[PDB]
Amino acid sequence: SNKLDSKVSGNYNYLYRLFRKSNLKPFERDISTEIYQAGNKPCNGVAG
Amino acid sequence: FNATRFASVYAWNRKRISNCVADYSVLYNLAPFFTFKCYGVSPTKLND
Structure with a gap:
């Protein structure tokens, strides 16, 4: 899809997920964007 | 991460870590x- 999905500055319309609580059952859709806390602290913050 | 004196940019100190x-x-x-x-x-x- 180089001919149809190419842009000089790079398209940001395409995203993917890297972190979540656990794996996915077959044919499961996840749309949630809630923050993912990892170490110990409660986060609940936009970044950090 | 607690060394007293770091190294110059052109002479960066490298330490190998294994068996831990x-x-x-x-x-x-x-x-x-x-x-x-x-x-x-x-x-x-x-x-x-």
């Missing part, structure tokens, strides 16, 4: 300004 357990847990305890932005691996994974 790697407790990345005690790395995230400093007064802010802590830029941690990796590549090629999940921050989480690192520990497995």
Whole structure:
């Protein structure tokens, strides 16, 4: 899809997920964007 | 991470580490300004 999905500055319309609580059952859709806390602290913050 | 004197940019000090357990847990305890932005691996994974 180089001919149809190419842009000089790079398209940001395409995203993917890297972190979540656990794996996915077959044919499961996840749309949630809630923050993912990892170490110990409660986060609940936009970044950090 | 607690060495008294660092090295010049052109003569960076390199240390090889092997034959240990790697407790990345005690790395995230400093007064802010802590830029941690990796590549090629999940921050989480690192520990497995």
